[PDB]
Each structure stands twice: as structure tokens, then as C-alpha cells.
Nucleic acid binder design. Structure first.
Ligand SMILES: [Ca+2]
Ligand SMILES: [Ca+2]
Ligand SMILES: [Ca+2]
Lengths: 207, 207
DNA sequence: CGATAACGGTCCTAAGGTAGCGAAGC
DNA sequence: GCTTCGCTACCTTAGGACCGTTATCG
């Protein structure tokens, strides 16, 4: 339990990079979990319908389904639409991040670069996001969730189904169905480093 | 649904004040709920075992149990130690704020001064905090909570029992039991607005 | 006569939300 | 050759977490 302004020791940082490197190689998720609990000294959590409702309200507060569009020269067009699920939390709160990992049975917990002791859980694979993350929200979040977040969910889902149909491979599906969703979902349009400044700017670069 | 950078419009702000001004005059809480439901177009709710567990996760995320220590010239010792529970959310998520109100049966929703469109729900009445808020944390939160947050609950509760026994108007207990719990729960020590630099300074002032 | 309820104001990083690049793979 | 994985750095604001007075009330 580390206090405000107090940093994650560089060694624990080392070990985290290491145990993430390990699961990458062996794909032993079961061992990923074990590694984490020992590193962060985390008590077991059984995964019950109750702990899952707890998680669900935690994600309502703390999680984000977002979509980036960035330039990739080698890509079929100039650009790439890249969804992610992520949840942030200070180390003191890893127990709840660790709960998420067990429920989704996928994800990686990293240190948040630039932060003193902040951790982040991300799930970027599209199969994991359709099979694990989206059905979680529909099952345990949506009933209690706000209109803005419910829409967030249907839209992330729409995108992923598009991707299932190679609409990012096509061009009259991309510009007119994928990029829209990206634009409608931004919460930081106007950012300094922003991929693109508006819908059309990205549409007029798919071209 | 307000976009990033959209202020909550002034007609709503004014209407929220009349609504808070009305419940303070009448004490008709069911009616406060009705007014908020209609002001924000919120779907009226069953409080279930299920929606409580969801609120538990949300509060782990967005709620704060805090203790402030501040000069008050007219008080027995010139300073007051003051517990507060609050929960903050952008207006697009008022629906879960309404759920909290509905589960605690008390609290007030107000606009966060100086924000685009954020709202804060507060409970400061010490009987409410004892009879409603902590029991909720005990029944639904603490099982899934992080070690730090569990300990903040126990320490909040320890303060509330001290105040009930009047430790705050006995110099010794104020100095020796009350102030040290305040000090251990601090999260903003060294902020420019802080009422006391540190624990010693607060014990010295009281003496 | 006080305590404390009541409620606004203030601070400011831990949370949200993004983009980029090398390496690895249908 | 083009898409996806992993990890790192990045940017930006709604959250947390206080503090300051004045109304209320036994
Ligand atoms: Ca990615
Ligand atoms: Ca939060
Ligand atoms: Ca008070």
C-alpha cells in the first residue's frame, strides 16, 4: 500500500515486464495469474455471479471501450482502426484489475508509462473482445449502465462485426461505416498528437 | 448526452437548484427523487440485490470517504475534523447517482462547481453515514475491495464512533486518537489549500 | 451558545483515452 | 505484403478529495 507521490520500485517494474514476457512465450494464463498474485501479493478471488456484478459497476466507473485511427504506411490504405478495452487503476487497487483478468481469462496488466504507480489492463485481440468483453457488458453492465455507455457498447460491437466481414479490407465499407463509428466514439477529438482532426480528414485519406 | 466540452445548460442548473431548495423546505425525499427523475429523464428503478452489487463496484471506482481538518474559530479547539462521503460523475451517468440516492434513501445531488457538466452526490450527516453509508460498504463493498479501501472504511467508522462518544471535545482524545486517524487517511498532504501541513502542526494548534 | 448540518469553493493527479513502432505471422 | 501483437510513450479532464462559510437547531 504505497502513499501519494510514492513510486513503484524499479524492480517490481522489472518483474512485471518479465512475467508478461513469459505468458507471451508459453501462453500459460494460469501461470500469468499465479505470477501476478505473488508479485502484487494479491489474495485469491472466486469468480461468482456477485463478484461479477461488482466488476460490472467498477467497469461502469473505470473502464473504456475505445477506437483509435492511426497512420500505417504499409497498411492497405494509409490508416488502421484499432479498438481496445482498457481499465486503469493505482497499484493499491490491483485486486480489482486481477478480478477482471479472471472473469475475462485474458488481458495484460502493465505499468502506465509516465505515472508514479498506475497500472492498466488492456484487451486488444478482436476475438477476445467479441467473445469475452462485449458479452460481459451485455450480461452484467447494460441493465444498470447509462445511455452514453450502452451506446458505447452497441457501437464497439458493430465495429467488431464489420471487421468480421473484412470491411477494413474494402473501401466503401471503411470510409462509410468503420470511420463514422470511430468519429462518433472519440472523447478526445482535438488532441495535440491526434491521428486526424475530423471524420472526412480520415475519409479524405482513405483516398 | 453531452459531448466533451459541452457545459450542462443553465436551465438545468437552475432547475437542479430549485429542486434542492424544494427538498430542504419540505423534507419530501420521494418527491426529490421524482423531480430528479423528470429533470434528467431517468428510468425509475428497482433496488435489487443485483443493482446493489453493481453500485458497490461503482463506488469502489468513483466514491470517496474522506476526512477534512480545518480551522473553525468558534469551536472548542479552533479546528473541526469532518467526515464526508461523496460520489462524482458527469451528468451522462446521473442514472447510477440516482441509484445511490435510491439505495441510501438520503443524499443530495448538486452540480460540481467549476465543471462543464459534472455532478456530485454528498452525504455528510453523521447518522446517515453511520446508519446508511458504512453498513452498505460492509454488506456489499468490502468483500471485493482493495486492502487500502477496506482500511479507509474501518477508519471512517472508527472516527464516527469517537464522535458519538464525544472524543472531539476532549483535548487528549482529539490530539491522540482523532487527529492520527485523520492524518493516516490523508490523500492530499502538501496541496496548497491544505488546512494543516502535517500531524504535529494540528496537534500544536489544538493545544 | 455552540455544534453540526448544509453547501459552495478549490486543487490537481489518477484515471480515462490515443498514437507509434518493431517484431511476428496468415 | 498486409494485418495483428506486444509494449511504450502520450495527451487531457472528469474525477476524488478536500476547505470555507453560513444556516439551523437543540
Ligand atoms: Ca493495438
Ligand atoms: Ca473513476
Ligand atoms: Ca459536517
Amino acid at each position: 500500500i504505497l502513499k501519494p507521490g510514492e513510486k513503484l520500485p524499479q524492480d517490481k517494474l522489472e518483474e512485471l515486464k518479465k512475467i508478461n514476457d513469459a505468458v507471451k512465450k508459453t501462453k500459460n494464463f494460469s501461470k500469468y495469474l499465479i505470477d501476478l498474485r505473488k508479485l502484487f501479493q494479491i489474495d485469491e478471488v472466486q469468480v461468482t455471479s456477485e463478484s461479477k456484478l461488482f466488476l460490472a459497476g467498477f467497469l461502469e466507473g473505470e473502464a473504456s471501450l475505445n477506437i483509435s485511427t492511426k497512420k500505417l504506411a504499409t497498411s492497405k490504405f494509409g490508416l488502421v482502426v484499432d479498438p481496445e478495452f482498457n481499465v486503469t487503476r493505482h497499484v493499491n487497487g490491483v485486486k480489482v484489475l486481477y478480478l477482471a483478468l479472471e472473469v475475462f481469462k485474458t488481458g495484460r496488466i502493465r505499468h502506465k508509462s509516465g505515472s508514479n504507480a498506475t497500472l492498466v489492463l488492456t484487451i486488444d485481440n478482436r476475438q477476445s473482445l467479441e467473445e469475452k468483453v462485449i458479452p460481459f457488458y451485455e450480461q452484467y453492465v447494460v441493465a444498470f449502465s447509462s445511455p452514453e455507455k450502452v451506446k458505447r457498447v452497441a457501437n464497439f460491437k458493430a465495429l467488431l462485426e464489420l471487421f468480421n466481414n473484412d470491411a477494413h479490407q474494402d473501401l466503401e465499407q471503411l470510409v462509410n461505416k468503420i470511420l463514422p463509428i470511430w468519429d462518433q466514439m472519440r472523447k478526445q477529438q482535438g488532441q495535440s498528437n491526434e491521428g486526424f482532426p475530423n471524420l472526412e480528414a480520415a475519409q479524405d485519406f482513405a483516398r
